[PDB]
Amino acid sequence: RLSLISGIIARLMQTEIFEEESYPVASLFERINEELPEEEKFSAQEYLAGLKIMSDRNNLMVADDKVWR
Amino acid sequence: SRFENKLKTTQKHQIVETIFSKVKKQLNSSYYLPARENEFASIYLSAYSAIESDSATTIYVAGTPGVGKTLTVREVVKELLSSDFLYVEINGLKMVKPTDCYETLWNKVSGERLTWAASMESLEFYFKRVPKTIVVLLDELDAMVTKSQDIMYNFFNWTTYENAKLIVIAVANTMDLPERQLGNKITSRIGFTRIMFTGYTHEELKNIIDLRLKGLNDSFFYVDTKTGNAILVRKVRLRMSADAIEIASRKVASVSGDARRALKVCKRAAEIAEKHYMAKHGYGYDGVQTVHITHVMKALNETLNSHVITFMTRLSFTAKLFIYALLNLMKKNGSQEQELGDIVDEIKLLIEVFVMEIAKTLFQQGSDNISEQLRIISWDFVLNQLLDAGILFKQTMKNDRICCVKLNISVEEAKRAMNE
């Protein structure tokens, strides 16, 4: 369930729409409901836990609070 | 040191300092920098920390030649003499054998001449025993890598000792060098600083020219009209058209971004106006002047244009007879590499397919007594003349029939120059 959205995040991270390896919280909110999967994105706590389980598997960590490394 | 006293002689009979002589004095490649301004700090702030803290680090810079990396690191250490170290220029290509740099280091600590073996013993004995400061430049690192990497492992293993009073500065040709020649065990020791130097840009290439043209651009000379001697009877001026300087920049930054190539094409274009000025008046060697755009148009092209086309049409007849036979086989067979006997087979056939007065002369220089020649006159000569010219190429065989011949220049331009 997170592999398809991780591949979507990776193919959107492949271009210069984030302009770095990092990406803002505004682009984080822009890439969850405005994109293709509808009602797959539940509450703030489970996607923050999804970013944390991507973080210990070295995919998407949490730093500086205005962007997300 | 010693013999520069003996390199001086006395009689200097008043050499004529003309208009363009004083340009080439400052257009010499010798004498803060605009282009690599901030990266000078990135070296220096990496260097200033280790110097004033008694450590051992490594600094790795790369780039194409002509970008100042020979220059910039000399400007690093130069100001540092004002504020504990021993400066050495360990050039890679200036070592005859690669082990000979080892002799220099042990020479440049106390003054002893020991073998490459015995130096690095005491060098290793230095680098882990001395209680507590050495700056070393490892220039042109393509030379000292070639044999078996056993030299290159040493020059970074000395950096690992915390009791090693040394600061190394490597300058290479390419950033790729510890990834396509060295091992990973060296690549751990090289670090990951990796300060990249790009080319120069054409705006900065204008900003490097006028640094040489600081006190002399559009200035005035004092000139006698009789000898052509200029002094910083008329009082003439000389101006440099900046647009021609700009079109010098927009090519050299485009192809190479080389700081020698930019200065030298200005230096070559300067002397074109020198001889044309000497042509019109003849002051020899004993209203307002300028340098046109038309000078740098020629001299930049003078870097490009060839003559092998003009060489071929100014060759002998049997030379042009030879190549025309050679392209005939290459379009007959399509194999681009023909046997030598078949060419001698062809030049016979290309006779009979004025021609008789040719064919008399083509096999004997007149003379009824000594005619009837198999291969043509001077056939060894033109084939030797086409060989050392670099146009042709012929593999070595004692058989003078089945030795193959390969072209070395493009065969179309050979076809094209043949048409004249």
Partner: protein, 325 residues
């Protein structure tokens, strides 16, 4: 050409092989082996008597003879001859022919020091080896006849001793009466080594010894594919944890389809696949830790841009369930 191959074999690791091999070679046919060894023991006085005649004794036969020669030379003969001449006993100089590092210079430098340095033979040291031994021979023709040295040459068809400039060197040694030459070979084409010139210098005699020994020491230098699928089996046990995962994703779709080229994967999609599990950032970060699989020759590439593993169909699932999992 459906051939059964050694790759399609149930393989055996290092400690598993050598221990059960050591069980057989010390317990298979133990009783009849010493039963042979007691039978041939009565031949030992016969060898002592013929060897006084300066006869180059040569032992052929199946099986290793290395243990048998060292019992016969060291313990039996070398003190027996010293007692029968009348003090340290007779010096034994073995030559391990199965050891390929035997040269002609080094062993002869031992020989002239093993033999008497009665004169300044270092003066004649200047290839003077045949020259120096010729001056040794004619002097030895007029000496009192007694053995002072016995040399042993194990595995005379060995990788260095069978070289021809070394063979003729031993030929001139054998004509001397003071030294007894007890050697063994194992080759089936060993009498191709000598003509009637050398055997004139040799005067060989022959005896069979066949104890069907396992050749423990003589198996060590030799190698087969037991001694790569097994080579890269150890590098993966010490790497980063990410390389295990990116090889796991490599090994799956490369075994999704022997392991040949056709089961391989394109570089672009594999970059996207290892971007899908948040592993590969881009091509460079993929390729750099893929050059480490390239540098230890753990994967191949041919042309789609196909990277494929050169191990078999059976091997990759063994690499799956054991080291990757």
């Amino acid at each position: 050409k459906s051939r059964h191959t050694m790759s399609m074999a149930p393989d055996v690791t290092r400690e598993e092989f050598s221990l059960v091999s050591n069980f057989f070679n010390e317990n298979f046919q133990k009783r009849p082996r010493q039963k042979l060894f007691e039978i041939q023991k009565k031949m030992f006085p016969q060898y002592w008597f013929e060897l006084t005649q300066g006869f180059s004794l040569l032992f052929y036969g199946v099986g290793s003879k290395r243990n048998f020669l060292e019992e016969f030379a060291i313990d039996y003969l070398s003190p027996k001859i010293a007692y029968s001449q009348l003090v340290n006993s007779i010096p034994c100089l073995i030559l391990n022919g199965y050891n390929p590092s035997c040269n002609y210079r080094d062993v002869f430098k031992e020989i002239t020091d093993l033999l008497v340095p009665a004169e300044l033979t270092r003066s004649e040291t200047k290839n003077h080896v045949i020259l120096q031994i010729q001056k040794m021979i004619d002097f030895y023709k007029n000496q009192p006849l007694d053995i002072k040295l016995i040399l042993v040459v194990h595995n005379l068809d060995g990788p260095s001793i069978r070289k021809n400039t070394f063979q003729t060197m031993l030929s001139f040694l054998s004509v001397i009466r003071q030294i007894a030459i007890v050697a063994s070979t194992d080759h089936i084409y060993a009498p191709l080594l000598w003509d009637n010139m050398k055997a004139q210098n040799y005067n060989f005699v022959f005896h069979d010894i066949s104890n069907f020994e396992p050749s423990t020491v003589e198996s060590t230098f030799q190698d087969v594919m037991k001694m790569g699928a097994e080579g890269a089996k150890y590098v993966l046990q010490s790497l980063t944890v990410n390389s295990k995962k990116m090889y796991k994703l490599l090994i799956e779709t490369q075994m999704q389809n022997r392991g040949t080229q056709r089961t391989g994967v394109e570089l672009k999609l594999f970059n996207h696949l290892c971007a899908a599990d948040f592993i590969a950032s881009n091509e460079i970060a993929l390729r750099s830790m893929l050059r480490e699989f390239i540098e230890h020759k753990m994967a191949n590439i041919t042309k789609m841009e196909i990277i494929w593993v050169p191990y078999t169909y059976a091997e990759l699932e063994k690499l799956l369930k054991t080291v990757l999992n």
